[PDB]
Symmetry: D2
Subunit: 283 residues, 4 copies
């Protein structure tokens, strides 16, 4: 499937904009298989527990959705999980504790097993932001658990994807790395949860379809066509993503201060986005 990690709107002063959040979700959901709320591009860690709960209550997804859970401890995680469950989330996408990760030890397994005991979840490996590893050994140890559905791997390290493919069964792999999308698919990924899918959801869907149908030549051409979009967006992060959505007329809002309202890569990104839009691949 193709799911986008929708951003969480804030006005210029940094106030959570619930109305915008709901409108944004409704404008994108029809174009994709489902939504990922509070993913790595969703600024979940920029919200207090109160805002976190408030933001999710403002949404009303019509399709099965995922909720990212990024906490440092089980006590802090408990509320996030209860909120996600009450919202009707299909599963959680949980990252490993970060700050004291070096002292975690076997606590990593204890963390995921505790959460999996209460709700289905996908392991969330996005080191570019969390800056901590999720050893393949740990993934293999957790893979047998009925409630550990699979993993969203945003690292862009396809050696990991190849590993899941060769050694893990009953384990659904989702890549969060747009630039190597076709490569991940070749290596067994079920699909992609891509920030770029917020902009060209139909294009990534088409790429996935070409691959599934064996139209390799067509898949490669689309992969090459989408490379610049995915590559630049990865470099621009949240500020670029939100600026792009605002440019297209969607209520994505702005990154929470002190982060910049505009991306230094806008000048380079604009023509790339407009080009795809002219081709009919945007939204």
């Amino acid at each position: 499937m193709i799911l986008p990690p929708i951003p969480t709107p804030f006005d210029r002063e940094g106030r959570l904009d619930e109305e915008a959040f709901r409108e944004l979700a409704q404008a994108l959901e029809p174009l994709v298989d489902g939504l990922l709320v509070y993913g790595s591009n969703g600024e979940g860690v920029h919200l207090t527990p109160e805002e976190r709960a408030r933001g999710l209550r403002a949404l009303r997804p019509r399709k099965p959705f995922l909720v990212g859970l990024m906490e440092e401890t089980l006590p802090q995680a408990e509320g996030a999980l209860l909120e996600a469950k009450a919202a009707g989330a299909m599963a959680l996408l949980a990252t490993p504790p970060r700050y004291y990760h070096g002292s975690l030890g076997a606590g990593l397994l204890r963390y995921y097993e505790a959460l999996a005991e209460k709700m289905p979840l996908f392991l969330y490996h996005v080191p570019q932001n969390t800056k901590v590893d999720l050893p393949l050994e740990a993934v293999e140890a957790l893979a047998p658990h009925p409630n550990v559905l699979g993993i969203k791997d945003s690292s862009g390290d396809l050696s990991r994807i190849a590993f899941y493919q060769a050694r893990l069964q009953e384990f659904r792999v989702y890549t969060g790395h747009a630039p190597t999308f076709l490569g991940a698919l070749a290596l067994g990924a079920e699909g992609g949860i891509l920030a770029a899918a917020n902009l060209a959801p139909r294009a990534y869907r088409a790429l996935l379809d070409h691959f599934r149908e064996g139209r390799l030549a067509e898949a490669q051409e689309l992969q090459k066509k989408l490379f610049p979009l995915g590559d630049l967006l990865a470099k621009g992060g949240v500020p670029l993503l939100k600026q792009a959505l605002r440019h297209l007329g969607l209520p994505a809002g702005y990154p929470r201060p002190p982060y910049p309202a505009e991306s230094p890569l806008w000048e380079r990104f604009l023509p790339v986005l407009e080009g795809l839009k002219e081709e009919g691949w945007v939204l």
Copy 2:
């Protein structure tokens, strides 16, 4: 000066223990120049905003104290700062935003200038945990600000300490790295805010005194004597620190789950701690 980053007590289930927190602070404060509440060893990021405020309200320091502020955004930082100010904190020890740090840009300066506009603060560089850098260029740009008192550098990279010494005036440098303490002092540090000072506060004070008084030979011998304690504690992190304090009879509590109640380094640390205790250097 010598200040210890006091841990924040949780019972085995992970519940904040306000009573223990207050008792712990009262048992250590007399032995040091002041306390650092919610420092990197204080598990501040393991608390919700509500627990954070509750924990600080439970304390009643008699000496000027510092409060660590580790948030990702200004909106989240505002409450933490107001709470610290109301508690009578002498200054904040603030770390840079982490999760989306790569997209921060000049927002780093905006972050600190916003906080410094409301309260005096020390820059907090502890990359081992925050996993993000605080460029010397940024430190030099912030150094002129009247409310940016100085910096606590826990990196153990004395090239940075040497830099502050040679290029920055009106900038108070505190090292948070125990194993190279004497080296930092030689390179101009005003003192140390060390986790090891929770265990042997009088020893680090003596080392500082020897250096200040020019008793270099005595300083080197004490530095060598304290090396094992500081080295092992750094490897053991919060779990080792709390287990050591509990062993000495203080109400340090336990790390918040999923972190381990006991450290894998205890067997190696025990004799080191007991040895210093027998010499009369503990608490």
Copy 3:
């Protein structure tokens, strides 16, 4: 194509074994499209200029071959290039200078342009060993040069492969990373120069063929089947490669002292190799 980086045989005392080198090359060449002499798995840097020239003179490839050139300066590179040219090498596979790489600057381009002026070459990016980067910006600047045929990328970072595919024409991409082989092919690689091809050359050829012919399902199954072999070999490096070849009866010799004659991963590798051999995929 499929080319193996043949190892350079040394007896147990570390003496170059020319006879073994020639016999080894003759035993493998028929099974592949060509050979890579002195590749990263060939211990070229373990030879003196004299041994380097002697070793190559001992070979008599019947198929177009490549010669790896790993030097720190142009003066040192000159002899290596002249030797390769006199041997009839189709092209060089040159790595960037290493030791003072941080001070190289634009000298990187000067290095490759100087070599390309005298002989056709492939850029050699194998950071795991050279421990230095080869910026995509530099690759793009060098790509237009008629004598810079392409690049062998052993990094396993498929974002780079995707980049070459989307932005570079007249640029032949070879991956040196076995575990993600199918992923690289999906992302445009012309083929692979794999250490694992020294053991199962026909298998990697079959995988390449399946992909080229659009037999994706068959390609994925073979990719999964070969994953353990490629993954373990990458971890075992040269010692494991040579021990495996010796086990199969080929005169691969031993790593030059102080490197170990046997790999710590042999016990885990043995059954993997024997399994593929029983299936008929070895040599």
Copy 4:
């Protein structure tokens, strides 16, 4: 002591200049306790075995000197060691094998023990260039050996220096990091083998003397005064070092191509060097 790692002169075309090498050594040796030939700043790895032997034969040190030995294998190391011994070198400064370091294992100890069996040596830890680690565990295992005199540590990681000081006896520690010199001295270093000593040998000697004599305030002021020189030189590397020596009229020659004849940091370095020269601290 204070020893400078003298550069090895090459003309603009990259030809080894034996005459210049000898003149350079004679111009610096009187100002220092001894010389380090083929140190990390000496471009030893930029020479073929023949040039290496030729270069050393051209020198005639009057004071006890050290010779750097940077090879990948024992067979390659043998000649370098024999040459150094025949030249009358007091000891070797050997780095660990690099290219296949990950597969070295216990071969690291075998390497040093083999060399130490034939000649006295200092371990050489300069990761910025070799890009490989030399575990403290390995240093401690090698420390008891009679012919392993000590270690030159250029890492700038004073935690390592503190370790040697607290745990190792009969082990002479030399720091190769100028910016933290006073810090290293405080932590027990016997002295420094600094590239900056090629320019201001008397200044670093004075700093060492101040520390040894307990004149801490004077030591700190000199440490601060020399910081800019050492900091910039470290950033400029060999090209900056040679350009500085040429500027002062010494026959340092140029870096071997493709490295730049001039450093991009010259404009910033010039005033720093001239300033120290005007103060009377240069050569």
